[PDB]
Amino acid sequence: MANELTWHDVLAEEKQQPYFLNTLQTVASERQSGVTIYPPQKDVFNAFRFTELGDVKVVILGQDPYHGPGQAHGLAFSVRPGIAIPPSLLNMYKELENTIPGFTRPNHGYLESWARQGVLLLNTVLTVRAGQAHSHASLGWETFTDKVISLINQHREGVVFLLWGSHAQKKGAIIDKQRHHVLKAPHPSPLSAHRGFFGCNHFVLANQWLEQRGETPIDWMPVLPAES
Numbered sequence: 001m002a003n004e005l006t007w008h009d010v011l012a013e014e015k016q017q018p019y020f021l022n023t024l025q026t027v028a029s030e031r032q033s034g035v036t037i038y039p040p041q042k043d044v045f046n047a048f049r050f051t052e053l054g055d056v057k058v059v060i061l062g063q064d065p066y067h068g069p070g071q072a073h074g075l076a077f078s079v080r081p082g083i084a085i086p087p088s089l090l091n092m093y094k095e096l097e098n099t100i101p102g103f104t105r106p107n108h109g110y111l112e113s114w115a116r117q118g119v120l121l122l123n124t125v126l127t128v129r130a131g132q133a134h135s136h137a138s139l140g141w142e143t144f145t146d147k148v149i150s151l152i153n154q155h156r157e158g159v160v161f162l163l164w165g166s167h168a169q170k171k172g173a174i175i176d177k178q179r180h181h182v183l184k185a186p187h188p189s190p191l192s193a194h195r196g197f198f199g200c201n202h203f204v205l206a207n208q209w210l211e212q213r214g215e216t217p218i219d220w221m222p223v224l225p226a227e228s
Helices: 018-033 046-050 087-099 141-154 166-171 202-212
Strands: 058-062 119-123 160-164 181-185
Touching: 018 141, 046 119, 058 166, 087 202, 119 141, 141 166, 160 166, 160 202, 181 202
Parallel strands: 058 119, 058 160, 160 181
Antiparallel strands: none
16 A cells, blocks of 8 residues: 555665765766666666555565676566576576465566565566676665665564575574564575475465465466456
């Protein structure tokens, strides 16, 4: 709804922060020089565009955004339509198919429908440089995304964070285990996957928790067409 608070009130105070600004003043210079920066600026804050504070239910963190063309668009793991399904996702798709019944691979890495459910797909660092993996880290984003978390953790009760990978598990250390449901597991990545992820069943336990508090469960089957 707007159902409690908006990102702008808990973020009125940060976005006008010295560090955050350099962070964007920086990217500003580069793009200027001619360094293709992904993803486009209009898309930078898309997660926050689609999942208001007061509407978070679940939370999945990503570290660095897709440095490859056509892929990135603001939401973690989410690739645009047409954009070939990145290994990571694939493994999620499967694990999904496997645990949730009836799920059958979407065939589009487009995951907007999830955020429209109240799932925040937050990449810890928000921008990066094409081809240059992890190229925009320590530029301050982590710091923005770090505060962002204490926000939900402190001004929101009973949240679901799914922690995949050690990095992100480093992130939610602050999260109160008592106030917010925190499921952990390896990284959907081809490497991580087999050895913890596959089988984690994070997608279902997630909803068991939401149903529990009487909430609306999540339809992990991403829809694509909306308008046309």
